[PDB]
């Protein structure tokens, strides 16, 4: 009940169906910390699959049925028992209603059945919050899970630039990308992109960018250039182009990654081909995080962590995620810290080799 809905006052910034986008807010009068969380929820990339999403996932495409309040959980909780890290922060939950991995900049019109405005929704939320206390902030942490985690990578630097051009260069913009660090790897079984379920992420995102009028960070765009902006949706490719500090949270054996790799576990014995596939996926993920100084990557088969009520339970090398985020805060005061690590990547090679992995 802690977060209260506000629909955007700028009615031109809309969910997929043209209804107003919005945000849920719980203010903390004492605090100059602001947490803006980007909800996840896959994406759609053509008329037919967006139509189907509108039938059975309408809250991800429309505000018409949104409730007036939401309960803050995990990193959005205001109870220190549940949220050791930022329980006293101003809390913002931004519903994902643009189906575009937070990248879109296109309105519904005579040529567009749907609006894809994810990148504009974030900018408009930031603008409207500045009159609600964000103008006094010292840190704005843009966080997100799954498609919202990818959205952090695509938008954190644009939020920084926006605040600079609005006259607030003192607000420190940082990112926390959870479960949004995907690999454009070989699938375990492969299909040509002939419909929605057969379309590999690289091809689905390439089509999505054109359907959404998707935008990516400027430095990444200049590296990959026209026709190749889909590359900037892959964390290991976009991360090195970013200037804002970003903490990366990623399960080594993410269930969404395995799904897009056409791996479906049943509990039956894993044979050698699939064993090597899974072990190689964990090794590749670990490799992409080698030069990411702020990261938390447990060897578990799971998906998302930061808004889960029991997010405090998982540890890597004996350090929980709330502790690692606290150590990250200390490291950004402006040399490593004794017993306060920020780079926590498991080295064991199979899901649940870490005993603190979520049970399910
Ligand atoms: C794949 C990919 C590559 C680069 C960037 C984003 C991305 O995808 C975002 C997402 O949200 N994906 C997703 C997949 C499978 C899922 N199963 N359940 N939720 C799921 C979400
Ligand atoms: C409303 O949003 C649109 C799209 O982002 C933007 O072009 C316009 O300037 C905004 N209007 C105001 C008053 O902020």
Swiss-Prot record:
Keyword Glycoprotein: yes or no?
yes
Active site, UniProt feature = 146 (charge relay system), 254 (charge relay system), 303 (charge relay system)
Entire-sequence positions represented here: 87 to 451 of 496
Where it mainly occurs, coarsely classed, is: secreted
The entry lists its GO molecular-function terms as: palmitoleyl hydrolase activity; phospholipase C activity; protein-containing complex destabilizing activity
Q: What induces it?
A: Up-regulated in hepatocellular carcinoma (HCC) with high intracellular beta-catenin.
Outline what the protein does: Carboxylesterase that acts as a key negative regulator of the Wnt signaling pathway by specifically mediating depalmitoleoylation of WNT proteins. Serine palmitoleoylation of WNT proteins is required for efficient binding to frizzled receptors.
> What keywords would UniProt list here?
Glycoprotein, Hydrolase, Phosphoprotein, Secreted, Serine esterase, Signal, Wnt signaling pathway
Q: Which Gene Ontology BP annotations are present?
A: bone development; negative regulation of canonical Wnt signaling pathway; negative regulation of Wnt signaling pathway; protein depalmitoleylation; regulation of bone mineralization; Wnt signaling pathway
* Catalysed reaction equations from the record: [Wnt protein]-O-(9Z)-hexadecenoyl-L-serine + H2O = [Wnt protein]-L-serine + (9Z)-hexadecenoate + H(+)
- Source species, please? Homo sapiens
According to its UniProt record, in which tissues is this protein expressed? Rarely expressed in adult normal tissues.
This one is known as: Palmitoleoyl-protein carboxylesterase NOTUM
Q: Where in the cell is it found?
A: Secreted
Residues carrying sugar: 10
Q: Which GO terms describe its cellular component?
A: endoplasmic reticulum lumen; extracellular region
Q: Report the EC number(s), separated by commas if there are several.
A: 3.1.1.98
What family does the Swiss-Prot or TrEMBL record give for this protein?
Belongs to the pectinacetylesterase family. Notum subfamily.
The top EC class is: hydrolase
């Amino acid at each position: 009940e802690d977060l209260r809905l506000h629909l955007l006052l700028n009615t031109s910034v809309t969910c997929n169906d043209g209804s107003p986008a919005g945000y849920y807010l719980k203010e903390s009068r004492g605090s100059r910390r602001w947490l803006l969380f980007l909800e996840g929820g896959w994406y759609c990339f053509n008329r037919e699959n967006c139509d189907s999403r509108y039938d059975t996932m309408r809250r991800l495409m429309s505000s018409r049925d949104w409730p007036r309040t939401r309960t803050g959980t995990g990193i959005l909780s205001s109870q220190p028992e549940e949220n050791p890290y930022w329980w006293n922060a101003n809390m913002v939950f931004i519903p994902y209603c643009s189906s575009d991995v937070w990248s879109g900049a296109s309105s519904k019109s005579e040529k567009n059945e749907y609006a894809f405005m994810g990148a504009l929704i974030i900018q408009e939320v930031v603008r409207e919050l500045l009159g609600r206390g964000l103008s006094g902030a010292k840190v704005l942490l843009l966080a997100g899970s799954s498609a919202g985690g990818t959205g952090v990578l695509l938008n954190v630097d644009r939020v920084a630039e926006q605040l600079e051009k609005l006259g607030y260069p003192a607000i420190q913009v940082r990112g926390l990308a959870d479960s949004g660090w995907f690999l454009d790897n070989k699938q375990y079984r492969h299909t040509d992109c002939v419909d929605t379920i057969t379309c590999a992420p690289t091809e689905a995102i390439r089509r999505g960018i054109r359907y959404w009028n998707g935008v990516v960070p400027e430095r990444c765009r200049r590296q990959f250039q026209e026709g190749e902006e889909w590359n900037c949706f892959f964390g290991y490719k976009v991360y090195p182009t970013l200037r804002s500090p970003v903490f990366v949270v990623q399960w080594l054996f993410d269930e969404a990654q395995l799904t897009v790799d056409n791996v479906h576990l049943t509990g039956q014995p894993v044979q050698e081909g699939l064993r090597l596939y899974i072990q190689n996926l964990g090794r590749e993920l670990r490799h992409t995080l080698k030069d990411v100084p702020a990261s938390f990557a447990p060897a578990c088969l799971s998906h998302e962590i930061i808004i889960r009520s029991h997010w405090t339970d998982v540890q890597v090398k004996g350090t929980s995620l709330p502790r690692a985020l606290h150590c990250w805060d200390r490291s950004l005061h402006d040399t490593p810290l004794k017993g306060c690590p920020v780079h926590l990547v498991d080295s064991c090679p199979w899901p649940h080799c870490n005993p603190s992995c979520p049970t399910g």
